[PDB]
From a paper:
Isopenicillin N synthase (IPNS) catalyzes formation of the β-lactam and thiazolidine rings of isopenicillin N from its linear tripeptide l-δ-(α-aminoadipoyl)-l-cysteinyl-d-valine (ACV) substrate in an iron- and dioxygen (O2)-dependent four-electron oxidation without precedent in current synthetic chemistry. IPNS contains a distorted double-stranded β-helix (DSBH) core fold (cupin or “jelly-roll” fold), which is characteristic of the 2OG oxygenase structural superfamily. Recent X-ray free-electron laser studies including time-resolved serial femtosecond crystallography show that binding of O2 to the IPNS–Fe(II)–ACV complex induces unexpected conformational changes in α-helices on the surface of IPNS, in particular in α3 and α10. The NMR and EPR results obtained in solution are compared with reported crystal structures of IPNS and new structures of IPNS covalently modified with a spin label, obtained under anaerobic and NO-exposed conditions.
Numbering used by the authors: 4 to 331
The structure:
């Protein structure tokens, strides 16, 4: 197995006002997006030093009682409103991964989309503050920290595609973003349950099968344990780990609106028997957000593709991925 070219891009100019410097970042984003589709954002300003400990302590200190109490509808029939947000339980002997997903903190009972009962909007559920001191505060602040990084990155992607820097970010708003954080624990297990290991067509043992992301972009922090592979014409290539940077790639919403100029890279998760933490942030727009497609390869930039409303895209995408690659 070969190794993917995944450049480390200093994204700090995207927070500044040096426009030429922003363009030089955008060129690097362009080149990565046209190559394997992945790059590492470095010099990003987020304090990642404790992200792994908090995630691990939360998952290791939360009890079975609390997991049922926070469980999404797939694990608890009593929680019909928790489709996206809540705890995703492991199944000892069968399923190793466990996670906790939360959405926009501004989705409260008073929010208009919650009052309208619009799909994909949910009020977050949280554990008991006394049993998990500071956890909710940490998690909500992290949401906005990675929101800010994602906003800057979206300015880089817009410039990379020849647009003004707010072409994407203008649709990415704290009041309505459908973006999500998932705090994933991949455990060390001995023996490791065979049922939790899938064998790819090429024989590689996997924890999660090939897929394109349901997102505009995906902004991921992970522990320093190599596991991701990206598919190229020459086969799957290993993505090296970097527990200081954020791994960035496009989702299928970006591929659609660019007439596949920036593809949504197909990737998968190798099985590795090692305790590790994964914290993806799925950059989703608002429910009614629509971006007019275009084709940067054509002189006139025109695309025949239908503009897709983001909320319908997300509803269709999250169900499709569950069907192909299983309930997580
Ligand atoms: C590599 C990571 C992204 C992670 N995989 C994942 O997060 C996988 C594939 S991108 N993602 C999903 O299943 C979609 C989660 C959507 C979330 N509940 C939401 O409602 O918004 C892994 O480490 O397995
Ligand atoms: C799991 C984790 O958060 N590790 C971080 C990553 C980094 C920035 C390299 N730090 O050194 C830690 C604490 C090892
Ligand atoms: Fe993915």
């Amino acid at each position: 197995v070969s190794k993917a070219n995944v450049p480390k891009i200093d994204v700090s100019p995207l927070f500044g006002d040096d426009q030429a410097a922003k363009m030089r970042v955008a060129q690097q984003i362009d080149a990565a997006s046209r190559d394997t589709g992945f790059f590492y954002a470095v010099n990003h300003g987020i304090n990642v030093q404790r992200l792994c400990q908090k995630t691990k302590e939360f998952h290791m200190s939360i009890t079975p009682e609390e997991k049922w109490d926070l469980a999404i509808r797939a694990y608890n029939k009593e929680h019909q409103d928790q489709v996206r947000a809540g705890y995703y339980l492991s199944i000892p002997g069968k399923k190793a991964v466990e996670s906790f997903c939360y959405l926009n903190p501004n989705f409260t009972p008073d929010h208009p989309r919650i009052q309208a009962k619009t799909p994909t909007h949910e009020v977050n559920v949280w554990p008991d503050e006394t049993k998990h001191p500071g956890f909710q505060d940490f998690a909500e602040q992290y949401y906005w920290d990675v929101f800010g990084l994602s906003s800057a990155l979206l300015k880089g992607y817009a410039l990379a595609l020849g647009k003004e820097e707010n072409f994407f970010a203008r649709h990415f708003k704290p009041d309505d973003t459908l973006a999500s954080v998932v705090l994933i624990r991949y455990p060390y297990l001995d023996p490791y349950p065979e049922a939790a290991i899938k064998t790819a067509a090429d024989g590689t043992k996997l924890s999660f099968e090939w897929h394109e992301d349901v997102s505009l972009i995906t902004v991921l922090y992970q522990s320093n344990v190599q596991n991701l592979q990206v598919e190229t014409a020459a086969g799957y290539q290993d993505i090296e780990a970097d527990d200081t940077g954020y791994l960035i790639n496009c989702g299928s919403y970006m591929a659609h609106l660019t007439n596949n100029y920036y593809k949504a890279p197909i990737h998968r998760v190798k099985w590795v028997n090692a305790e590790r933490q994964s914290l993806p942030f799925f950059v989703n727009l608002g429910y009614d957000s629509v971006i007019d497609p275009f084709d940067p390869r054509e002189p006139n930039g025109k695309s025949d593709r239908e503009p897709l409303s983001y909320g319908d895209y997300l509803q269709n995408g999250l169900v499709s991925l569950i069907n192909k690659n299983g309930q997580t």
